[PDB]
Amino acid sequence: GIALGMIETRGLVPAIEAADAMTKAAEVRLVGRQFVGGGYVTVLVRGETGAVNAAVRAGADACERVGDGLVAAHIIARVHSEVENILPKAPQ
């Protein structure tokens, strides 16, 4: 898939809950989980546009109450070719 879905959260517990909620909701691929530092954890899923919309919604709903909570839940239907260099391809 080409669409990118990202959910940033304050802590790794909401991120793991948000990353489980995503991959359980639709046909998405957990391409990365990055420790942004300062206590932010970002999970990025890649998949078809329709699936990514569903995955990110489930993730947002799931992490709003777990731990410090949800910082951002974002969808990019198609990312620019340049930006693909600053995105993970395997789940690290």
Partner: protein, 120 residues
Amino acid sequence: RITGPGMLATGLITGTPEFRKPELVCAPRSDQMDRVSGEGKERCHITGDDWSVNKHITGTAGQWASGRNPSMRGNARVVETSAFANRNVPKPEKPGSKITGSSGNDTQGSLITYSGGARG
């Protein structure tokens, strides 16, 4: 009724589905902070064929960049744990020395502490 580990934590657990011409060309430095800080700054009024854009011109930066991608902004509980954030932490009574003799016993300087927290 039934004591045990299932009774210990109440309300602290989650995820359990258990059943049941201004005077100066450049505006005052204080007046405004430029959206684009260096070399794009618009605080200085450059007349002529500058690259500035009016309201009549609609495009590139603006609603057209912001509204392309859906976004949800959650209200996170945000507390910064950093050195600067801890600069105002509650600190205990500053140590004081009853020492006598010639020991360079200076209290005007920055707080110097010895083993056990004794000032010195």
